[PDB]
Ligand binder design. Structure first.
Ligand SMILES: Cc1noc(C)c1-c1cnc2c(-c3ccc(C(=O)O)cc3)cn([C@@H](C)c3ccccn3)c2c1
Length: 127
C-alpha cells in the first residue's frame, strides 16, 4: 500500500487571521515541543512504507504530526486556537491507538503531551 498524501496545510479558500493565541501556539508551544529530545518521530507524517507499517493507515484515519501543525500555523490554516490544540491531541491519541501502552514510542508521546498540556495552561489573553 501507498502512503496517503499529508494533511492539507495551506488552503486559500479558508479565511486568515493572526491572533495572540495562535502566535503563542507557534512561537512557544510548538517551538518548545519541537526541540524536545523525543520530538523527532512526531516532526513529520508517519511514513508507513519506509517504516514497514502496513496496518498504520488502516486504523489511523485522522493522521496528524507536528510538521503538519507547524505548516498549518505558518499558513494561517487555523482560525481558532482550539483547532490547533485539537490537532496536537489527535497526534497523541493516534499514537496511543496504534501502539501498545508502555511501548517506547508511547512513552515518548506521553512526555511530549505532558509538556504540551503545561504550555497551553499559559496561553495569552484573547482579543
Ligand atoms: C509507529 C509510530 N506510531 O506513532 C509514531 C509517531 C510512530 C513513529 C513515527 N516515526 C518513526 C520513525 C522515524 C522518523 C523519522 C525518520 C527520519 O529519518 O527522519 C526515521 C524514522 C521511527 N520510528 C520507530 C522506529 C520508533 C522510533 C522511536 C521509538 C520507537 N519506535 C517511528 C515511529
Amino acid at each position: 500500500g501507498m502512503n496517503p498524501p499529508p494533511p492539507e496545510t495551506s488552503n486559500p479558500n479558508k479565511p486568515k487571521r493572526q491572533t495572540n493565541q495562535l502566535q503563542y501556539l507557534l512561537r512557544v508551544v510548538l517551538k518548545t515541543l519541537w526541540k524536545h529530545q523525543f520530538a523527532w518521530p512526531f516532526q513529520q507524517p508517519v511514513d508507513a512504507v519506509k517504516l514497514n507499517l502496513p496496518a498504520y493507515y488502516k486504523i489511523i484515519k485522522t493522521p496528524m504530526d507536528m510538521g503538519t501543525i507547524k505548516k498549518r500555523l505558518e499558513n494561517n490554516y487555523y482560525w481558532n486556537a482550539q483547532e490547533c490544540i485539537q490537532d496536537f491531541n489527535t497526534m497523541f491519541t493516534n499514537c496511543y491507538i496504534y501502539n501498545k501502552p508502555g511501548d517506547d514510542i508511547v512513552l515518548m508521546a506521553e512526555a511530549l503531551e505532558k509538556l504540551f498540556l503545561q504550555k497551553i495552561n499559559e496561553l495569552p489573553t484573547e482579543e
